[PDB]
């Protein structure tokens, strides 16, 4: 059970910091809004 | 047999979310602002390719 928790901890860490290609969590959410159909300035 | 595209050779740059150009706010308009060292540029998220910033490349708000 500890090993599975280790895998999920790394998955969240990689999502929140990113091959890695690190990017701030703000510019990333702006990128997501583009996929939705909304404009980044929103 | 799947053929795929794999990026490589990452390089770091300083980035900003918005730019003025004259007491204003401009956004990348499906891009990202990158500071090479000489001036700011607009480029794709993959395959760094400097492009000079312009009114068309951005939308004002």
Resolution in Å, one decimal, please: 2.7
CB-based contact, A36 to chain B, within 8 Å: no
How was this structure determined? It was done by: cryo-EM
Cα distances from B50 to residues A13, A14, B16, B25, B29, in angstroms, run 30, 28, 15, 21, 15
Select from A18, A19, A36 the least CA-distant residue to A28. A18
Cα distances from B11 to residues B1, B24, B51, in angstroms, run 31, 30, 17
| Token pair 């939705």 in the structure block, residue | A36
- C-alpha to C-alpha distance for A29 and A5, rounded to whole angstroms: 26
- The phi-psi region of residue B17 (left if phi > 0; otherwise alpha if psi is between -120 and 50; otherwise beta) is alpha
Return the C-alpha torsion angle A39, B45, B28, A36, nearest 10: 0
CB interface of B with A, residues 25-54, below 8 Å: 25, 27-30, 32, 45
Task: Give burial (CB, 10 Å; 0-12/13-18/19+) of A38.
Answer: exposed
């Amino acid at each position: 059970d500890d090993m599975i928790a280790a895998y999920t901890a790394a998955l969240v860490s990689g999502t929140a910091t990113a091959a890695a290609l690190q990017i701030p969590f703000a510019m990333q959410m702006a990128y997501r809004f583009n996929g939705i159909g909304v404009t980044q300035n929103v | 047999l799947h053929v795929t595209y794999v990026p490589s050779q990452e390089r770091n740059f300083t980035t900003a979310p918005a730019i003025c150009h004259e007491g204003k706010a401009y956004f990348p308009r499906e891009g990202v602002f990158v500071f090479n060292g000489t001036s700011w540029f607009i480029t794709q998220r993959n395959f760094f390719s400097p492009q000079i910033i312009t009114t068309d490349n951005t939308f004002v708000s």
